[PDB]
Amino acid sequence: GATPSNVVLVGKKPVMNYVLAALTLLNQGVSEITIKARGRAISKAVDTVEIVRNRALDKIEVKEIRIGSQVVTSQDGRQSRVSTIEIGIRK
Amino acid sequence: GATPSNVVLVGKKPVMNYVLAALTLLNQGVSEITIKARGRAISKAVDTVEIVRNRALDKIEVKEIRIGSQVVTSQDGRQSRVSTIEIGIRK
Secondary structure (H helix, E strand, O other), rough: OOOOOOOOOOOOOOHHHHHHHHHHHHHHOOOOOEEEEEOOOOHHHHHHHHHHHOOOOOOOOOOOEEEEEEEEEOOOOOOEEEEEEEEEEEE | OOOOOOOEEEOOHHHHHHHHHHHHHHHHOEEEEEEEEOOHHHHHHHHHHHHHHHHOOOOEEEEEEEEEEEEEOOOOEEEEEEEEEEEEEEO
């Protein structure tokens, strides 16, 4: 539990912010990193990985990809679906 | 080579257009389908898969996911990167 959290949550910010977060983790010695996103940010999660694959040149490999759905519960109890992606990369 | 082409290329159209294309393939007896997209359409490819997994109910499973990059060559020879996703699903 003491090693730096290896998750990069990709949201609304410019893609290069998440690229910087992944590169910072690589420089801490964290060799396995998980990029997670939901909804429209799924494309930005893939961009983050692909940009990092170039900026780390070191080989970075995609280890695992999972897609799925999560439930969004509204203030009045209605429930709707959002897509998710999780991408594991490894140095 | 005579069976219906099992690829759904997801682009700029409303997501339900690609949902319908995948369901049409399922109705044709095609049990393995590949959803492909690039750039900002990557999010819509994932949504396509997740929406179909509900509308098929038949259990549709994600078989393989691959992400990568392709090169876009401009009219004057410059080259730039675009992200890709490919998602194989199976009934």
